[PDB]
Amino acid sequence: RVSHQGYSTEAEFEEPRVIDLWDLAQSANLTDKELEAFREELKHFEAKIEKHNHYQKQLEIAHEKLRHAESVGDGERVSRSREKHALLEGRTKELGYTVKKHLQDLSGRISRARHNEL
């Protein structure tokens, strides 16, 4: 399950109180219609942040092996390191932005929790 790296290279929107507010939002005081709508929307959300996490982990493992690959001179794997690294970083910037967007959106909606869906 998602957990902090504890560096300066993740995105600090993992599970502070955000997904947590949405965790109690599975039963807090919303409505049945809203709930099942939220349920699917967050199921896509959780899935995507879970994959972001998977790639942040592969990034740190890439980064470690990168400094270790540049520290051999192999060239080919130095480049393949950079290629998959740029890909993974592309997904961190984009997913992180998308998370922050939906963060403020769902934070917006659930903090009312309107009544007839949101």
Side-chain angles (χ1 to χ4, degrees):
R1 211 271 211 71
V2 76
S3 292
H4 58 177
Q5 216 91 285
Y7 273 113
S8 281
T9 187
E10 57 263 80
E12 209 222 340
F13 296 125
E14 305 193 318
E15 188 165 67
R17 255 97 213 203
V18 163
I19 311 304
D20 314 73
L21 99 93
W22 306 340
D23 202 68
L24 326 96
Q26 205 205 135
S27 197
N29 205 315
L30 303 90
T31 50
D32 275 343
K33 225 282 170 184
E34 193 300 314
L35 181 287
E36 193 85 278
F38 139 105
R39 219 278 198 100
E40 71 148 271
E41 99 179 307
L42 249 90
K43 220 72 197 284
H44 283 235
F45 199 77
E46 69 87 344
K48 258 291 165 67
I49 186 76
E50 206 227 328
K51 288 160 178 194
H52 179 246
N53 155 27
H54 200 112
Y55 283 20
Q56 299 194 171
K57 282 287 175 181
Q58 290 300 293
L59 249 160
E60 236 57 65
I61 295 156
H63 169 57
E64 184 240 270
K65 290 270 75 172
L66 162 62
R67 70 165 105 275
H68 210 308
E70 281 196 315
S71 194
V72 50
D74 172 99
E76 164 65 339
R77 88 192 64 190
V78 175
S79 299
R80 237 177 184 258
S81 286
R82 264 183 169 258
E83 170 268 304
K84 227 297 198 315
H85 187 289
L87 143 61
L88 266 25
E89 272 240 47
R91 171 57 67 225
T92 56
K93 204 286 112 71
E94 183 174 280
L95 195 271
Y97 154 75
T98 308
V99 158
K100 189 267 143 173
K101 262 293 297 160
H102 252 152
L103 243 66
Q104 246 183 254
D105 201 345
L106 280 59
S107 171
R109 305 174 198 194
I110 298 200
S111 301
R112 39 190 181 284
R114 215 310 88 155
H115 54 75
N116 282 15
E117 174 269 327
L118 310 208

